[PDB]
Amino acid sequence: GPRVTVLVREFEAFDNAVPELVDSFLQQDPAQPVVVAADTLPYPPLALPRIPNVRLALLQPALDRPAAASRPETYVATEFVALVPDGARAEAPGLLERMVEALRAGSARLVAAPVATANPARCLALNVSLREWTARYGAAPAAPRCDALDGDAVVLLRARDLFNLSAPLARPVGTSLFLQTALRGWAVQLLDLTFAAARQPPLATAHARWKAEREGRARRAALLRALGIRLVSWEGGRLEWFGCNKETTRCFGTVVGDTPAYLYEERWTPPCCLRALRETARYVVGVLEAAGVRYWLEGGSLLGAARHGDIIPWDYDVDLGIYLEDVGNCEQLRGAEAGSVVDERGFVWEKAVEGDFFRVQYSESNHLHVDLWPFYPRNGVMTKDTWVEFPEHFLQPLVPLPFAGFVAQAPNNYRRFLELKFGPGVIENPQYPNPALLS
Amino acid sequence: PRVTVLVREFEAFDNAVPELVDSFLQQDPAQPVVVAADTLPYPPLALPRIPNVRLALLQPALDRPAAASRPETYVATEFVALVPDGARAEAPGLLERMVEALRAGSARLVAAPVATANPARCLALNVSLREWTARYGAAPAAPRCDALDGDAVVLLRARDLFNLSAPLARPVGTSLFLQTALRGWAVQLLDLTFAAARQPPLATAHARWKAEREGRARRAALLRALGIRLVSWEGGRLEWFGCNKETTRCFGTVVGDTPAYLYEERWTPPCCLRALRETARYVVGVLEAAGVRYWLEGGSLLGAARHGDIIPWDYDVDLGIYLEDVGNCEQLRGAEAGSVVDERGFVWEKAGDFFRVQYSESNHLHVDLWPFYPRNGVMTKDTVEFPEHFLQPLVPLPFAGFVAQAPNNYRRFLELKFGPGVIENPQYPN
Amino acid sequence: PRVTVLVREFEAFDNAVPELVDSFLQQDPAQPVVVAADTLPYPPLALPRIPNVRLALLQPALDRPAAASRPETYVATEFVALVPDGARAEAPGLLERMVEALRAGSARLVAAPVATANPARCLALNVSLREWTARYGAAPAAPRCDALDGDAVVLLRARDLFNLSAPLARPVGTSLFLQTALRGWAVQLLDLTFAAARQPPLATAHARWKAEREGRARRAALLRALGIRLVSWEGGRLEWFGCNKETTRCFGTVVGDTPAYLYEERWTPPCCLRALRETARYVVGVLEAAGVRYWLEGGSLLGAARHGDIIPWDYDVDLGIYLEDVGNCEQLRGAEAGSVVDERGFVWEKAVEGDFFRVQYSESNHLHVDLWPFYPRNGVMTKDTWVEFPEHFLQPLVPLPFAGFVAQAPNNYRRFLELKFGPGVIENPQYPNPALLSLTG
Amino acid sequence: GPRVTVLVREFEAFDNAVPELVDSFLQQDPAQPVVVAADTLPYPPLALPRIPNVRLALLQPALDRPAAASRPETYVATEFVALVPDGARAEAPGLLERMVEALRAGSARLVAAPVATANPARCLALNVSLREWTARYGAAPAAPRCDALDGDAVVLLRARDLFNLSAPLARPVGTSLFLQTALRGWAVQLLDLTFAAARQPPLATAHARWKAEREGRARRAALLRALGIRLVSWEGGRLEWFGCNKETTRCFGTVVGDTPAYLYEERWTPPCCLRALRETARYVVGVLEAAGVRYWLEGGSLLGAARHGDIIPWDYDVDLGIYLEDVGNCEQLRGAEAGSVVDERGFVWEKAVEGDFFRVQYSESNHLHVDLWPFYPRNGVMTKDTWDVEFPEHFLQPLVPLPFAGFVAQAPNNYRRFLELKFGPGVIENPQYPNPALLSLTG
Ligand SMILES: *[C@@H]1O[C@H](CO)[C@@H](O)[C@H](O)[C@H]1NC(C)=O
Ligand SMILES: *[C@@H]1O[C@H](CO)[C@@H](O)[C@H](O)[C@H]1NC(C)=O
Ligand SMILES: *[C@@H]1O[C@H](CO)[C@@H](O)[C@H](O)[C@H]1NC(C)=O
Ligand SMILES: *[C@@H]1O[C@H](CO)[C@@H](O)[C@H](O)[C@H]1NC(C)=O
Ligand SMILES: *[C@@H]1O[C@H](CO)[C@@H](O)[C@H](O)[C@H]1NC(C)=O
Ligand SMILES: *[C@@H]1O[C@H](CO)[C@@H](O)[C@H](O)[C@H]1NC(C)=O
Ligand SMILES: *[C@@H]1O[C@H](CO)[C@@H](O)[C@H](O)[C@H]1NC(C)=O
Ligand SMILES: *[C@@H]1O[C@H](CO)[C@@H](O)[C@H](O)[C@H]1NC(C)=O
Ligand SMILES: [Mg+2]
Ligand SMILES: [Mg+2]
Ligand SMILES: [Mg+2]
Ligand SMILES: [Mg+2]
Ligand SMILES: [Mg+2]
Ligand SMILES: [Mg+2]
Ligand SMILES: [Mg+2]
Ligand SMILES: [Zn+2]
Ligand SMILES: [Zn+2]
Ligand SMILES: [Zn+2]
Ligand SMILES: [Zn+2]
């Protein structure tokens, strides 16, 4: 009744137990369909049995092959497919059949069986938010029904479901598969069945292990970058980042038309970029306060503070107003008028090209910035020479207002200040930076 | 509902297999297709070189493993559809509908005719290995039948097809249903119809004649391999695949009078039985032409009394003759000097008490003639006896398609020679 | 019990298999024994009716499952010992001794001679599927061999034997080592001897004659089925199993210009090459006696310049001739009026299509030499149907070995070839490419 | 209904004329199907007309898209596709239909029309050899029938043919398309039709051109490495290399079970590896001749010299024999007995792990090597006390010149005999190129 193709994707060419894996399934059924998938032909040779029911699917482009040759669904003729990791072995007979039976009888589109390795699979919850570039894992509230798995498992599903995914075999599969299935609201049922481990497991030496863990980590980082996951969180608070830092370029490059590239991709500001802007805003405020420079939250930064005490989630910089006469109080600002200045913490201060303002960048390589706009009073009206004006009484006095994790100084009556600069109801009506292009 | 298309019946010199395959790929580009052949077809089929289309070469090769010639290893799906050359897929989901009918019905095979010039028809089929015979007729319970004649897509479970002894032996239309009918399986001839190829194969008369010739040769080789010596039809037509006047007989030299077919748990090959009947008829004609008194003897008289024919596991014919009449017939006179091959190719020899007439020089199915003489009211030979009144007179008795001569009161005669109740209690081989 | 005795080489009408089986059961009543046959042997073998002795009938049958004709179905031990008829177990423990030898050495097979009149000899064997040739010779590293000649018990793992395509194809002594030698497997001939049967089979001249006639027929059918067209011993004593003067050529009609053997990932059959060499030598001899100027052309000239023979994946021979010399040859004059079969069976024909002449090996075998007549016009040899070349390449002609005789070639033939084919053609063969042929067609 | 889909793949996000291109085709037929294909959403925005017959095809995996979304055939519903490069514009009406008419009536799978830029397309010959990892370009002998094009052209072919290729839209299309079509034996016919250039051409400054060329050359280098093209040549020269060199590891790395990785790929030795082997062989021979070491071609090197004067194209090292008595003549060899020596030109000389031979590697990183096998006479026989079959000494008295790998080396006298003794009768005449099927069976 049930035909199941075994599909092997997670293995290392320098050190693997794929021959044992495939032979253990052949011992239960000599005609068992098996597909080993690889990006390039493994060397040293896998030396799989060269029989028609065992096939190697190379997922690489080639001058002498058709398109179908790198599409793994054309190697799978059966209704069901079972993803089997290296290090597993078939020992008990008919396990795939019991998995098929459980899937037909259940409600999850995926069923799974742990492998009795030193790291068997465990049930996990998972939320994916592409707009915020974040994947949030947690403990499974309704185990053994999960959104994702952590560790080694045989995962069985219908071929039509697996190969309608965008990247069915992207490595690591343990990360890539459940990111895609959870996003679609699919569940994986963790069954009470266990596959045995290989008798001679792969990666038996500490050096061979260490080599494999580093290659895997490199593949996971590349995968998350390819798919737009900048941040992974775990319950307990553990964070791992996959985007910006002080030592790299910022994520999105130069902005045209006030609308950064990620907005056209229906995503908001990457969380790593937002983290850096908050750190730069916190730092610059500390420097100005220690130097005796009067400053106040400006533009979108003040708007975000008034709404929810933080940067607007699709914004990409921070604006502060300062008193023009106070500029000479700050060492970095005095230096900036002479040229670019890299200070005690690696931040870069410059007097800008465009319009008589200062710009503080997170680092020499990461150009996320705070802009400082000098104003001087003319007759109770704050103004500048290169370009709106506003009454000085909004700055007399300033008021405290949470922003980006700290307390910042804002104009008093900032609701009216914001409506004077943006229009009535701006606090209550969020918009994109300019809606004629994108709303 | 995954079904592998499997193509076995085509000719390399003239086929429509590329169109057949392309037509199924137009409905599903990932459709599993297996084209099976004994050797690599030339001119090249030039099938699409995609993973879901595969050529399975069934003959042994020095550079291949055992699995490479085993077809179940090319088929991963639950169901398999045998598709003949000349068919094409036009509407979608026809294999799906065949799968539904199979699961809904009670026949292990379902079939959909192909709209060729010879779309499949239902047939009844009765297979007797003991008698080396397959009997075909009209199907009483159509559209449920034992076998098909003509073009059809046939769908069954892969586990059923590939546990057969010769699942892809050619011609499939003969070999498959011989095996399924023997197992008591039925094929349901569904009401769906597959279209014919838009450019059919064998368009010329020469090509069709060539293909019919090769096909007849394959069917003959297949039936001889599988132990079918006779195919008979309702209405009387006979098809012979055994020995004849110019060949050896099917079983050769006998040892311990137990011919080889008995150890195979079979009876006498029907072609051998036919040759014995013709030799019996011929010899009787010669004997009666020359005025030689003969009567049925031994197992021949027993079979005549029982069912008017040779006992179906027997392998010769015995006749008694009056020793005093031997000189009346030329062949017997010659047989005393040496072997005589007469005008009709029969071989008469003396060799021994008796005379032996063989069907031909190559085919050694024979009639033995046993001369007796009346000594004092008892018939006797010189190397068991019986009273002469059993021959005074002789009586007509049908045997082997003609009217033979038998001793009078022959049921009593037979119980003399074999024991009481021999006619009613045949000694069946075991 | 780790070894199953398997008997495949015997004749139904005259064998010593009952003594063979008995001799092994006398040493161990539980010894697994399998007698393999295509059909039920007659007269009856009458083997002991015990669970460890089985007769395996390998032919498909209307009333049997697929497994009944698969020999691995009948073996449940790690090893198989192939034992020929005429052997007998006398000393106990011989099979266990072969297993120990096998495990401790590097050969996949180990063998023990049987003490018959034809005890097994160690042989070298190279199998070339591309050239359809099996080359035997004396074994340089005896007692490590590629093949055996004569009677021996051969032990190997059941997993190795039954993974082969034709594990029990007859004669086993031929088919087994063709398959194992191709895989690079060695057989080690041990210092162990099995005794001969006390009543040997085939003890009369007539019985031996019947057996050898049947054996020869099975061997010929086996080599044709497996694509071995030529068997040689030390490069000589050639045995042919392909086409000849009275048959069609092996590959038949070519479409369009890719013969069948290239799709089979092989080269030209050596019997076809042999017929081409004979035809080229005959035609050249005819042209020379008649006084027809000729020279090697095209791939024939390329082959001669490369290695003095036909390019081994090519399938014909090309010669250029002087058009004005055509009249000096009876066969060529006859060919312009119609097809001519000359006194030695060669068929000379004039191509109405391409304006050349064609000489075929025989009426049935269409391996051919093509003759291309050129005529000079202002010092350039040219033709009226289709590359032309300067006449000085033919003034004079030079000798050049080709296909076992000395042929005529243009002078400066290296330059000549480079002009026709391109620079470096002689040093860079266009080797057949199965992968590419699969792609292009 | 239209029968051609315009497909735009070659353009740069930072500076393109794709909006003008799309508009020019829509002006001839507002229903004209147009696909713009890209690996990521182009930024700045292309702002293409939001109509059903204009579509952006993003060829990238994404967590929220089905498999079909990244497959370009999904976006084409017509029989034909016209690949149009940025910088082109549709002015004359009906040019695509004339191309369809040309393709149907001719015998080329592809037809093309130059674009009137500063780099209009030219007709080229192209031979692709996967076994030799080489793409050989040249002037087209049968123009306007070509194997490949260089420069800007609109190329038309059946969608069924384009999207059946392994890498139909791999960049640069001008390189990857014709590598795939020429390998298949398909021809492209350059038609006598011309597309106009855009009124505002892209990449109009030297700086913009510089940025575009740097990226395009990076895409090309990555493309050829992924496809196994190690060498590009023009008219047999102007060599362009994409393999290993003195500063890298060799292509096939560590060899396991006497079978290098290129054999399992069903190819021969990479041409960069062969180039480095010839250079190392010439260098080592030059060193031995200057130092007064007697040497001769040995084994498969001698076989290759005798057969065609070069390394056997699927071999991966070089073997020479030397008189052991002469070893002390060479400084590098005398140092090699103490330990590894990196000489003045980066070559690494070592005395073997076990086996009593010397090894000279191309560099510290690149381990392509020449092996030197020392022999010594024991009364007429050459022998090494470690085991390269022993042979009579008269084959070395005298030595003979033999072309090998671009220079003249020394070989044993009567080398045909010599070779047949070591390899067997007829070895020179019977080369056996690798059999990947046999390899797939034997391992
Ligand atoms: C059978 O032979 C093939 C070679 O064609 C090999 O790949 C496979 O591993 C072998 N299987 C066994 C069980 O030895
Ligand atoms: C996932 O989202 C659901 C829906 O709001 C929420 O109840 C749950 O706490 C989230 N879990 C994690 C681990 O983010
Ligand atoms: C995608 O799913 C459909 C049915 O929803 C199925 O017919 C098709 O084969 C699937 N595609 C792949 C590539 O698996
Ligand atoms: C696709 O390309 C392969 C060659 O690799 C060929 O066999 C197949 O027929 C092609 N299919 C189409 C539709 O062109
Ligand atoms: C098969 O046997 C049945 C009785 O079991 C008989 O009625 C039928 O006629 C036989 N088949 C044929 C084709 O005669
Ligand atoms: C025979 O049938 C059994 C049970 O259905 C199955 O396990 C086996 O695979 C079949 N044999 C084949 C398909 O060759
Ligand atoms: C077999 O091939 C080897 C080369 O690999 C050769 O030395 C030997 O002479 C050959 N033997 C025969 C009998 O051809
Ligand atoms: C391509 O190959 C052909 C035939 O081998 C040859 O004539 C031609 O010169 C080659 N062209 C190039 C550019 O190498
Ligand atoms: Mg802002
Ligand atoms: Mg700003
Ligand atoms: Mg046709
Ligand atoms: Mg009798
Ligand atoms: Mg020719
Ligand atoms: Mg060498
Ligand atoms: Mg070496
Ligand atoms: Zn960032
Ligand atoms: Zn008969
Ligand atoms: Zn031949
Ligand atoms: Zn290299």
Curated annotation (Swiss-Prot), chain C:
Cofactor or coenzyme needed: Mg(2+)
GO molecular function: dystroglycan binding; identical protein binding; laminin binding; metal ion binding; phosphotransferase activity, for other substituted phosphate groups
Region feature (Zinc finger loop): 243-272
Pathway(s) served: Protein modification; protein glycosylation
Glycosylated residues in this chain: N126, N163
GO BP annotation list: adult walking behavior; basement membrane organization; bone mineralization; brain development; camera-type eye development; connective tissue development; connective tissue replacement; creatine metabolic process
Highest taxon of the lineage: Eukaryota
Membrane topology: Single-pass type II membrane protein
Effect the entry attributes to changing P269T: In MDDGB5; severe form; brain involvement; intellectual disability and cerebellar cysts on cranial MRI
Disulfide bonds: C122-C145
One Pfam family in the UniProt entry: LicD
Reaction catalyzed: 3-O-[Rib-ol-P-3-beta-D-GalNAc-(1->3)-beta-D-GlcNAc-(1->4)-(O-6-P-alpha-D-Man)]-Thr-[protein] + CDP-L-ribitol = 3-O-[Rib-ol-P-Rib-ol-P-3-beta-D-GalNAc-(1->3)-beta-D-GlcNAc-(1->4)-(O-6-P-alpha-D-Man)]-Thr-[protein] + CMP + H(+)
Effect on the protein upon substituting D316A: Decrease in ribitol-5-phosphate transferase activity. Does not affect protein expression. Loss of ribitol-5-phosphate transferase activity
Variant or mutagenesis effect after changing A68G: In MDDGB5; uncertain significance
Known function: Catalyzes the transfer of a ribitol 5-phosphate from CDP-L-ribitol to the ribitol 5-phosphate previously attached by FKTN/fukutin to the phosphorylated O-mannosyl trisaccharide (N-acetylgalactosamine-beta-3-N-acetylglucosamine-beta-4-(phosphate-6-)mannose), a carbohydrate structure present in alpha-dystroglycan (DAG1). This constitutes the second step in the formation of the ribose 5-phosphate tandem repeat which links the phosphorylated O-mannosyl trisaccharide to the ligand binding moiety composed of repeats of 3-xylosyl-alpha-1,3-glucuronic acid-beta-1.
Similarity comment: Belongs to the LicD transferase family.
Quaternary structure note: Homodimer; disulfide-linked. Tetramer. Forms a complex composed of FKRP, FKTN/fukutin, and RXYLT1/TMEM5. Also exists as large multimeric protein complexes. May interact with the dystrophin-glycoprotein complex (DGC).
Name of the molecule in the record: Ribitol 5-phosphate transferase FKRP
Organism: Homo sapiens
Gene name tied to this protein: FKRP
Curated annotation (Swiss-Prot), chain D:
Phenotype when changing P313L: In MDDGC5; uncertain significance
Outcome recorded upon mutating Y43F: Affects the tetramer assembly. Decreases the ribitol-5-phosphate transferase activity of about 80%
Pfam families: FKRP_N, LicD
A single BP term in Gene Ontology: oxygen metabolic process
GO molecular function terms listed in the Swiss-Prot or TrEMBL record: dystroglycan binding; identical protein binding; laminin binding; metal ion binding; phosphotransferase activity, for other substituted phosphate groups
Highest taxon above the source species: Eukaryota
Keywords for this protein: Cardiomyopathy, Cell membrane, Congenital muscular dystrophy, Cytoplasm, Disease variant, Disulfide bond, Dystroglycanopathy, Endoplasmic reticulum, Glycoprotein, Golgi apparatus, Limb-girdle muscular dystrophy, Lissencephaly, Magnesium, Membrane, Metal-binding, Secreted, Signal-anchor, Transferase, Transmembrane, Transmembrane helix, Zinc
Required co-factors: Mg(2+)
Lumenal side: 1-443
Protein name (Swiss-Prot/TrEMBL): Ribitol 5-phosphate transferase FKRP
Species: Homo sapiens (Human)
Lineage: Eukaryota, Metazoa, Chordata, Craniata, Vertebrata
